[PDB]
Design a protein around this ligand. Structure first.
Ligand SMILES: CCCCCCCCCCCCCCCCCC(=O)OC[C@H](CO[C@@H]1O[C@H](CO[C@H]2O[C@H](CO)[C@H](O)[C@H](O)[C@H]2O)[C@H](O)[C@H](O)[C@H]1O)OC(=O)CCCCCCCCCCCCCCCCC
Ligand code: CLA
Ligand code: CLA
Ligand code: CLA
Ligand code: CLA
Ligand SMILES: C=Cc1c(C)c2cc3nc(c4c5[nH]c(cc6nc(cc1[nH]2)C(C)=C6CC)c(C)c5C(=O)[C@@H]4C(=O)OC)[C@@H](CCC(=O)OC/C=C(\C)CCC[C@H](C)CCC[C@H](C)CCCC(C)C)[C@@H]3C
Ligand SMILES: CCCCCCCCCCCCCCCCCC(=O)OC[C@H](CO[C@@H]1O[C@H](CO)[C@H](O)[C@H](O)[C@H]1O)OC(=O)CCCCCCCCCCCCCCCCC
Ligand SMILES: CCCCCCCCCCCCCCCC(=O)OC[C@H](COP(=O)(O)OC[C@@H](O)CO)OC(=O)CCCCCCCCCCCCCCC
Ligand SMILES: CC1=C(/C=C/C(C)=C/C=C/C(C)=C/C=C/C=C(C)/C=C/C=C(C)/C=C/C2=C(C)CCCC2(C)C)C(C)(C)CCC1
Ligand SMILES: CC1=C(/C=C/C(C)=C/C=C/C(C)=C/C=C/C=C(C)/C=C/C=C(C)/C=C/C2=C(C)CCCC2(C)C)C(C)(C)CCC1
Ligand SMILES: CC1=C(/C=C/C(C)=C/C=C/C(C)=C/C=C/C=C(C)/C=C/C=C(C)/C=C/C2=C(C)CCCC2(C)C)C(C)(C)CCC1
Ligand SMILES: [Fe+2]
Lengths: 37, 31, 301, 438, 75, 32, 32, 335, 61, 34, 32
């Protein structure tokens, strides 16, 4: 597991790897906000 | 208001929402 | 090149030939012709092959009591595995034929031929001055051919597991593959079935709509389906026709490539259980029982 | 400042294509994407460390990065045992912070900054047709890659060492002292056929060869970098290549798809750069371990599990005979010049070899998308799919996609160079000038 | 009238702010309370097998099947 | 209703006739 | 339990971290 | 008022005028048959996948309520005891009890029949819309193929068999079960009609991909055709050897390939409905029997079919109550 | 010690979230980078220094 | 067998050389109007 | 309310429902 000092911060790490998918969805939603120029 | 498109959308959606609620409820079912 | 005042180069690139050869054709025509000749010869007459090194000579030649449907070019012997087995490595031509060397010869030459065929498609896209992506579309059947003939042997570690060059052999390969990897339940093959069914669907719709429109379209389809048609312009419709089957077949080829490396389809065996833990059957485990039958009957041993 | 379709000719679904001629915005996008890569590296390293129990093997826990760090000899002891997990955590954290820096940089040059830095910063400015400057950039990156390879070499030689799985008694973090710099040995791996037996570079069988090849590649890449910085392509090079941004992207896509296929096969087969102590048993390794452990178990209580290879060697019998090319650390000690010899199989077998063989038999790379181990005709009882299977599958998919991308972009680059990107000229066509008889 | 106008307008959101959650909750009570099992005949997880029957039920009578299914189920 | 099956079938016939009459009346009313 | 709640909070904060930026740009400044 | 020759307005004229209005959705006269039937077919399938069980028909737990996902959820066919009963809610079995009617598997019959009539209504809708804008109804004729497939495999095939039990249940995993059932029992792959159908389907997919790619690649730069027919014709003449010189015939061929393939598949499944199947080549069977060493991929296929049959009939056909001891179940090592 | 490290690292979490929210809107808004260069650079410096001190505490622990 | 090996190697080398030299012969893609 | 924001919200709720469905696929009935 993580080192003891960072043990309470396990849950945030559990959502870190999924963020690139959120980046591609962010590109898509930004384009939607732009109205697909 | 009670147009044909209204009737079609509601007939497709109201059961859809009910079934989605049922499915989500049974997701957290026992066992 | 540059032979006799570049006459050979002029002729190879010449577009006046009935069939454009091209520099990619320089490799396709010999490779494809060698594969064709060896396949025809092996199908017509070839000694039985030990598809597995158990010394059970499976026979796939027409002269050896087979028909067109049953006849096949047997995969290479499991003893050879992934080893390169051209004629010059076998102790004799009889030994080469007995171990299924013609299958490797045909598969290698044919894969090179189809790759150079994509190449020729690009070459004549460029020569005629059009946008060269017919090769990209053709990469789908080529991808599937590579997956069934090259990638699956690589993953399984033996060319004996490649698809036999036959019809009944193809069915046997498919049955075995479902037995061992649950092809039907894998999302990529499911997506490929969707791709093929939708390809037929859109081919039929496009044919019917264009045939009916050519009295000498958009309104008919709009009133027919309730969401209307997004591809109002013909260019978008034709790109959709290109994309749907192409990417569906790309994904089924990729699915097979993944199962080559032992990544099977969805396994929902004993997914649902009783309160006491008793397994409740579904369609998944009936498929599993079928797979068990195929698996046990495959292992001739 | 995202422009629009009319002013650039590229729709939103081709939006990034608008960055071909925007050097600064393109650089910003590239740096942001590098930040994304490093973000995923750090995030997944931290995720796996948080979900990593040292007592269990890495492959039993579906860890992909942790094997990669361990192969460098970071926090791993003899036999693949884990001494401490701190090296992996610090690797992940450093990756995450560096990714933060890279992401801030990528947002710069893209949101606000020089859109086209050709004139403000001539050193960093480039025009795709400008062969000299493109070669300058290529040479800079060749120098960087050579420095990375030499950094690996220094890590293996002048540092704690690299995890040699071929050391006696299993494996351990060995310090490489005399890497094989013999040119013939290094390039015979290239010359080796990619078929069964030879196996091409996937058949490296010792860290000495790997580090020697890395020395050679680092030196070659450095020399090529200084060569490209100080040289312009020859007339034949200028004649045989399309010189445009999409052409370079096509070339990179083709090379990187080939590399993806190579990585797939090497992760599926190789077990020295991918030690089986971390990535799990190779499929061939799993089958051979099954046969070997059955052999020793039946001997505890020769024709049952031994036969003759087509070449002539003594190999394991049954359906695993196809995997007779497998060369593992736990099997070579009991292997003689004539394949496997009965005397060593009777006396040489140490308990650690048997334990490793049993462990590899249990955790074969058979799996399913449900992360369920075993053959498809197996009940839901175990949860394991070997990291080798995941790596091979994912990287084959990515390599195939990137080869398709090479095809697409190379076709488009040739069309753009020849003016066919728009379509067929309506007024006249190349076909209309040819003889009607096809 | 068109999709853009009707979904953009806040009237749709306010009128459907009390209905869509109402239907979702209706489904949730339909499932959790077990009314789905009672009305659709789906056995609950603790009643797939009874004390009399310890295997998958089988119905043989074609016409007199109502009573057979009543017996096979918990009832 | 000499048999329960015949009673049920006739009930179904009248139910379907009622459904057809209802849809016919609905289209008639909504026509104008 | 508490760890799952913290994970959900982190997930929703992440999911909003981008939409917050785009909505701020759409409202404030107008560049987007 | 309005009519052919001064015909007085009647109720039918008003109904036809209302049903054919150019509103958001074309209802039409065929709408009265399509919308109720199709809506109820979809609703029945969704309800069956969500709530109704298959425990009392097939001995399976196949629905979202019981714990199955999208792939394994299905509306299982009625038990073999029901034979070909249409299983009305008011029928002699499940006499008005909706709960038991769902338990009897009558929901599959509901979905199947209402979907058959929805398909009829949709074909009639194609005809009506084609007549509305005065176009040839080639799309309805094309849809005759999927209707033929549905009638052959969901209605004619069970009708020729012992009951609705052996129809394909409306589900992904259940359809896979049906497919493997045909493989094991009917050797449906070896059937020449299935061969023609798969050839047609793959050829239609090929035509779709090739036509899309070529029309998108032979596009003209910047009332008139948008792609160069001559260029595509030359490209395929000099690449493949044959090319379409007429757009009309090309699109008609794209129409004809999948339709013919599915129709031949439907004929083959009609044959299978009576167990009239091209299962075996008698010559090869006798050759293998007399010569143990002789073996081909066809004999291996027959062995795999036997394995599927014997290992699956225990659970796939509960009504037969088959209990195969381990010693009689066919195995590869037992050959 | 451990609690000091945890509070400093939670502060780093919050400052990083604030930077994610602000740096993009600061950069993309018209006249955003100008007249706010000091603020954004101070935020980046604070984030870097806080990372460094968190690392120092980790070394101490 | 060795004679066959040499013959096949020669044939493959000849064809691959033709392929490579032919693609080296083709003029580079250029736009006449620009 | 902007249409793009409505689409974003609908997509986020759909993704959440899909995640809940898969979570149930891994815990509870149908999880073994
Ligand atoms: C071009 C492809 C040529 C055919 C390659 C066939 C093959 O068997 O190639 C596999 C080889 C690896 O070969 C293996 O190499 C192995 C090396 O491992 C050995 O040594 C290792 C180190 O000790 C381990 O000990 C291991 O256990 C031991 O067996 C063995 O020699 C095996 O017998 C041998 O099969 O990969 C390689 O050479 C390099 C990678 C080749 C990638 C080819 C993938 C297929 C791509 C087709 C196109 C896809 C579709 C695109 C769209 C169009
Ligand atoms: C390959 C990526 C890349 C490239 C090509 C550029 C290029 C440029 N940047 Mg950008 N930048 C990047 C990454 C990059 N930057 C990143 C990651 C950040 C975030 C820290 C920034 C932040 C940034 C700012 C804030 C500014 C620039 C500016 C500039 C311009 C001038 C910079 C210069 O010459 O000073 C170079 C100065 C130096 C002191 C050189 C330092 C080199 C050391 C050795 C760093 C270590 C590099 C080494 C190879 C290790 C590699 C690490 C690797 C493993 C990740 C130029 C167009 C400036 C500009 O356009 O306006 C004037 C500007 O204001 N950049
Ligand atoms: C991860 C891959 C990636 C990357 C690095 C980029 C990068 C870029 N794209 Mg591309 N794009 C991508 C994926 C990607 N895109 C995808 C998947 C699509 C399909 C939807 C597009 C579609 C697309 C179009 C249609 C266009 C771009 C454009 C651009 C440029 C934006 C220039 C500008 O003024 O910003 C414009 C955007 C804004 C001002 C608002 C963006 C604000 C976001 C929300 C910031 C998020 C920051 C981040 C989460 C915070 C972490 C960093 C923090 C620590 C500092 C930039 C170079 C544009 C361009 O330059 O072309 C001319 C353009 O027209 N892209
Ligand atoms: C180094 C890699 C690389 C780079 C830099 C580019 C860059 C570019 N490509 Mg290319 N491309 C690549 C790889 C690459 N591509 C590969 C590998 C393929 C094959 C799949 C393609 C296929 C392709 C096509 C067909 C087209 C481009 C186009 C473009 C341009 C605009 C793309 C854009 O705005 O994004 C837009 C981004 C999106 C719309 C998002 C797409 C989201 C995808 C479909 C979902 C993926 C899901 C998941 C991750 C898949 C995983 C699979 C797994 C099994 C491995 C730009 C010059 C377009 C163009 O006009 O070029 C000039 C164009 O038409 N590319
Ligand atoms: C309008 C479209 C439509 C169509 C075509 C169908 C068609 C069908 N439904 Mg569906 N259904 C519909 C609407 C429709 N339904 C609606 C709106 C509902 C909701 C109430 C249902 C609810 C429903 C259920 C619950 C069931 C069906 C079933 C059936 C099937 C059998 C029906 C049958 O034979 O008895 C009805 C047939 C008639 C009434 C015959 C019509 C002929 C004339 C008009 C009647 C005679 C008139 C004459 C003048 C009087 C003669 C007197 C004489 C006796 C002396 C059939 C496939 C059953 C089935 O097979 O499921 C498995 C079933 O269980 N349907
Ligand atoms: C599995 C493959 C497949 C599917 C799913 C499919 C589906 C569809 N094709 C249609 C059209 C067509 N299909 C065509 C050619 C083809 N279609 C093919 C294969 C398919 N076609 C093939 C191979 C061809 C080549 C001949 C044509 C030419 C058309 C059209 O004109 C039409 C269209 O416009 O295309 C978009 C639509 C029919 C109108 C409708 O909603 O039904 C209305 C009637 C209904 C819904 C009642 C039937 C209900 C049935 C029995 C299923 C009920 C149960 C569930 C809903 C499904 C269970 C699913 C589980 C098994 C997983 C629909 C989108
Ligand atoms: C009106 C239109 C309705 C359209 C319905 C489409 C089918 C989805 C039904 C709901 C469902 O299956 O999820 C219901 C399942 C429920 O999942 C299960 O729930 C059970 C409840 O007790 C248990 O918890 C199980 O363990 C759990 O796995 O959710 C999923 O499997 C997630 C994947 C959903 C995949 C969606 C379909 C994607 C492929 C088809 C796409 C085209 C479909 C539209 C074509 C037009
Ligand atoms: C407990 C039930 C829960 C239901 C779900 C909750 C929502 C409420 C839904 C109510 C309806 C449910 C279904 C009834 C469930 C139920 O309990 O049914 C029971 C009932 C049968 O009752 P009996 O057979 O005992 O009654 C005998 C006689 O008095 C009447 O038949 O069926 C009917 O109501 C009539 C059938 C439908 C109408 C006639 C057939 C329609 C098709 C006509 C087609 C004509 C052709 C036209 C061509 C164009
Ligand atoms: C341009 C743009 C784009 C893109 C972009 C990108 C892609 C970016 C990236 C970026 C990035 C990539 C960033 C990053 C950042 C990072 C950070 C900021 C980090 C932080 C960290 C931290 C804070 C940590 C913490 C921790 C640790 C250390 C470990 C343990 C645990 C914890 C968690 C505590 C798009 C197209 C969409 C649109 C337009 C705009
Ligand atoms: C580290 C390593 C190693 C080694 C390495 C090496 C040695 C490498 C090398 C590498 C190399 C050595 C590479 C190469 C490559 C090449 C290529 C990739 C080529 C390509 C080509 C092309 C692409 C062409 C084209 C063309 C032509 C032909 C002409 C005309 C035009 C064109 C352009 C079409 C070892 C094993 C020891 C260890 C482990 C790993
Ligand atoms: C009277 C009657 C009836 C009827 C019924 C009905 C009519 C029903 C309906 C129902 C319905 C009407 C339902 C619906 C459902 C729906 C659902 C269940 C959905 C789902 C969806 C989903 C799951 C989605 C997903 C997704 C994703 C996530 C991906 C992206 C996109 C999308 C969104 C696609 C009954 C049977 C009672 C009885 C007999 C008679
Ligand atoms: Fe067309």
């Amino acid at each position: 597991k993580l080192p003891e000092a960072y043990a309470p911060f396990a849950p945030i790490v559990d959502v870190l790897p999924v963020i690139p998918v959120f980046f591609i969805l962010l590109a898509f939603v930004w384009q939607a906000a732009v109205s697909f120029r | 208001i009670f147009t044909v498109r209204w009737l079609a959308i509601h007939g497709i959606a109201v059961p859809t929402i009910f079934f989605l609620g049922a499915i989500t409820a049974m997701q957290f079912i026992q066992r | 090149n540059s032979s006799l005042w570049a006459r050979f180069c002029e002729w190879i690139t010449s577009t006046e030939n009935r069939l454009y050869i091209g520099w990619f054709g320089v490799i396709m025509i010999p490779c494809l012709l060698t594969a064709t000749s060896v396949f025809i010869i092996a199908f017509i007459a070839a000694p039985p092959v030990d598809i597995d090194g158990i010394r059970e000579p499976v026979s796939g030649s027409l002269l050896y009591g087979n028909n067109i449907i049953t006849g096949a070019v047997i995969p290479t012997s499991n003893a050879i595995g992934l080893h390169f087995y051209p004629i010059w490595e076998a102790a004799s031509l009889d030994e080469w034929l007995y171990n299924g060397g013609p299958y490797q010869l045909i598969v290698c030459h044919f894969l090179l031929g189809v790759y150079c065929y994509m190449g020729r498609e690009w070459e004549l896209s460029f020569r005629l001055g059009m946008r060269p992506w017919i090769a990209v579309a053709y990469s789908a059947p080529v991808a599937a051919a590579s997956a069934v003939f090259l990638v699956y042997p690589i993953g399984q570690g033996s060319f004996s597991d490649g698809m036999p060059l036959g019809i009944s052999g193809t069915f046997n390969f498919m049955i075995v593959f479902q037995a061992e990897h649950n092809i039907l339940m894998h999302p990529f093959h499911m997506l490929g079935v969707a791709g093929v069914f939708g390809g037929s669907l859109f081919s039929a719709m496009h044919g019917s709509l264009v045939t009916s429109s050519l009295i000498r379209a958009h309104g008919y389809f709009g009133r027919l389906i309730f969401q209307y048609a997004s591809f109002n312009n013909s260019r978008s419709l034709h790109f959709f026709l290109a994309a749907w089957p192409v990417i569906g077949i790309w994904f089924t080829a990729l699915g097979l490539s993944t199962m080559a490396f032992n990544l099977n389809g969805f396994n929902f065996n004993q997914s649902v259980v009783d309160s006491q833990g008793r397994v409740l059957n579904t369609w998944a485990d009936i498929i599993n029982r079928a797979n068990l039958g195929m698996e046990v009957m495959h292992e001739r041993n | 400042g995202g422009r629009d379709q009319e002013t650039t000719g590229f729709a939103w679904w081709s939006g990034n294509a608008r960055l071909i001629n925007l050097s600064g915005k393109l650089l910003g996008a590239h740096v942001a994407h590098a930040g994304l890569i490093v973000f995923w590296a750090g995030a997944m390293n931290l995720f796996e460390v948080s979900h990593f129990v040292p007592e269990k093997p890495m492959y039993e826990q579906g860890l992909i990065l942790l094997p990669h760090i361990a192969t460098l000899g970071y926090g791993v002891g003899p036999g693949g045992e884990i001494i401490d997990t701190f090296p992996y955590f610090v690797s992940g954290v450093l990756h995450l912070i560096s990714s933060a820096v890279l992401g801030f940089g990528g947002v710069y040059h893209s949101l606000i900054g020089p859109e086209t830095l050709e004139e403000s910063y001539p050193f960093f400015g480039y025009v795709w047709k400008d062969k000299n400057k493109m070669t300058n950039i290529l040479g800079y990156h060749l120098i960087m890659l050579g420095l990375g390879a030499w950094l690996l070499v220094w890590k293996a030689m002048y540092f704690g060492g690299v995890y040699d799985t071929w050391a006696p008694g299993g494996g351990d973090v060995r310090v490489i002292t005399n890497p094989t710099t013999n040119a013939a040995v290094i390039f015979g791996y290239l010359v080796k056929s990619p078929f069964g037996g030879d196996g091409w570079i996937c058949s490296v069988d010792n860290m000495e060869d790997i580090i020697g090849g890395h020395i050679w590649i680092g030196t070659l890449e450095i020399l090529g970098g200084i060569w490209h910085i100080y040289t312009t392509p020859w007339p034949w090079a200028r004649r045989a290549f399309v010189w445009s941004g999409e052409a370079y992207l096509s070339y990179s896509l083709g090379a990187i798809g080939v590399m993806g296929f190579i990585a797939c096969c090497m992760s599926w087969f190789n077990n020295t750069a991918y030690p089986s102590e971390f990535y799990g048993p190779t499929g061939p390794e799993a089958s051979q371990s099954q046969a070997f452990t059955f052999l020793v178990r039946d001997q505890r209580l020769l024709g049952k599990y031994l036969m003759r290879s087509p070449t002539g060697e003594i190999i394991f019998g049954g359906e695993t005979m196809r995997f007779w090319d497998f060369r593992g650390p736990w099997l070579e000690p009991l292997r003689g010049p004539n394949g496997l010899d009965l005397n060593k199989l009777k006396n040489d077998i140490q308990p650690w070899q048997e334990r490793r063989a049993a462990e590899y038999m249990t955790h074969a790379p058979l799996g399913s998308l449900n992360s369920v181990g075993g053959v498809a005709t197996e009940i839901n009882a175990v949860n394991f799919v070997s990291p080798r299977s995941w790596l091979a599958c994912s990287h084959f998919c990515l390599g195939f996609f990137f080869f398709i991308g090479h095809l697409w972009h190379a076709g488009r680059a040739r069309a753009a160079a020849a003016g066919f990107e728009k379509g067929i000229d309506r007024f006249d066509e190349p076909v209309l000038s040819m003889r009607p008889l096809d | 009238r068109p999709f853009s106008d009707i979904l953009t307008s806040i009237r749709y959101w306010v009128i459907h702010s009390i209905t869509v959650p109402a239907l979702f909750i209706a489904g949730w009570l339909f499932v959790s309370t077990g009314l789905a099992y009672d009305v659709f005949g789906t056995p609950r997880p603790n009643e797939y097998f009874t004390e009399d029957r310890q295997e998958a039920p089988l119905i043989t009578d074609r016409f007199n099947a109502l009573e057979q299914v009543k017996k096979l189920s918990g009832n | 209703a000499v048999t329960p099956s015949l009673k049920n079938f006739l009930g179904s016939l009248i139910a379907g006739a009622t459904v057809l009459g209802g849809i016919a009346l609905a289209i008639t009313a909504v026509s104008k | 339990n508490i760890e799952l709640a913290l994970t959900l909070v982190s997930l929703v904060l992440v999911v909003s971290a981008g939409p917050l930026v785009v909505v701020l740009l759409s409202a404030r400044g107008g560049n987007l | 008022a309005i009519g052919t020759y001064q015909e007085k307005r009647t109720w039918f004229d008003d109904a036809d005028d209302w049903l054919r209005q150019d509103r958001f959705v074309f209802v039409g006269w065929s709408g009265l048959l399509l919308f109720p039937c199709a809506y109820f077919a979809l609703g029945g399938w969704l309800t069956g996948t969500t709530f109704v069980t298959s425990w009392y028909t097939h001995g399976l737990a196949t629905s979202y309520l019981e714990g199955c996902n999208f792939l394994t959820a299905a509306v299982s066919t009625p038990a073999n005891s029901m034979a070909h009963s249409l299983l009305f809610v008011w029928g002699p079995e499940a006499q008005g009890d909706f709960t038991r009617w769902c338990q009897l598997g009558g929901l599959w019959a509901f979905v199947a029949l209402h979907g058959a009539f929805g398909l009829i209504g949709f074909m009639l809708r194609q005809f009506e819309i084609a007549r509305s804008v005065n176009l040839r109804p080639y799309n309805a004729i094309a849809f005759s193929a999927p209707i033929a497939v549905f009638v052959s495999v969901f209605l004619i095939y069970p009708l020729g068999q012992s009951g609705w039990f052996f129809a394909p249940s409306f589900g992904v995993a259940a359809i896979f079960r049906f497919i493997l059932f045909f493989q094991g029992f009917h050797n449906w792959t070896l059937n020449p009609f299935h061969m023609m159908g798969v050839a047609g389907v793959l050829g239609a997919a090929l035509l779709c991909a090739i036509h899309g790619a070529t029309v998108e690649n032979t596009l003209f730069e910047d009332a008139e055709e948008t792609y160069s027919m001559v260029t595509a014709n030359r490209f395929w003449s000099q690449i493949f050897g044959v090319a379409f010189s007429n757009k009309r015939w090309l699109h008609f061929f794209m129409l004809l390939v999948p339709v013919t393939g599915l129709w031949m598949s439907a004929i083959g499944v009609v044959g299978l409905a009576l167990n009239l199947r091209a299962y075996d080549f008698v010559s090869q069977e006798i050759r293998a029997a007399e010569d143990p060493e002789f073996e081909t991929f066809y004999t291996k296929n027959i062995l795999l079919n036997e394995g599927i049959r014997a290992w699956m009939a225990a659970q796939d056909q509960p009504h037969e109550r088959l209990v195969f001891p381990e010693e009689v179940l066919p195995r590869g090592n037992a050959l | 010690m451990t609690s000091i490290l945890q509070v400093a690292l939670l502060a780093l979490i919050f400052v990083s979230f604030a930077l994610v929210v602000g740096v993009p809107v600061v950069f993309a808004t018209p006249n955003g980078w100008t007249d706010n260069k000091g603020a954004v650079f101070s935020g980046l410096s604070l984030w870097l220094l806080l990372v460094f001190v968190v690392g120092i505490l980790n070394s101490f622990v | 067998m060795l004679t066959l090996k040499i013959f096949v190697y020669t044939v493959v080398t000849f064809f691959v050389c033709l392929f490579i030299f032919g693609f080296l012969s083709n003029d580079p893609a250029r736009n006449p109007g620009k | 309310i902007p249409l793009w924001l409505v689409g974003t919200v609908v997509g986020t709720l759909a993704i959440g429902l899909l995640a809940v469905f898969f979570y149930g696929s891994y815990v509870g009935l149908g999880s073994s």
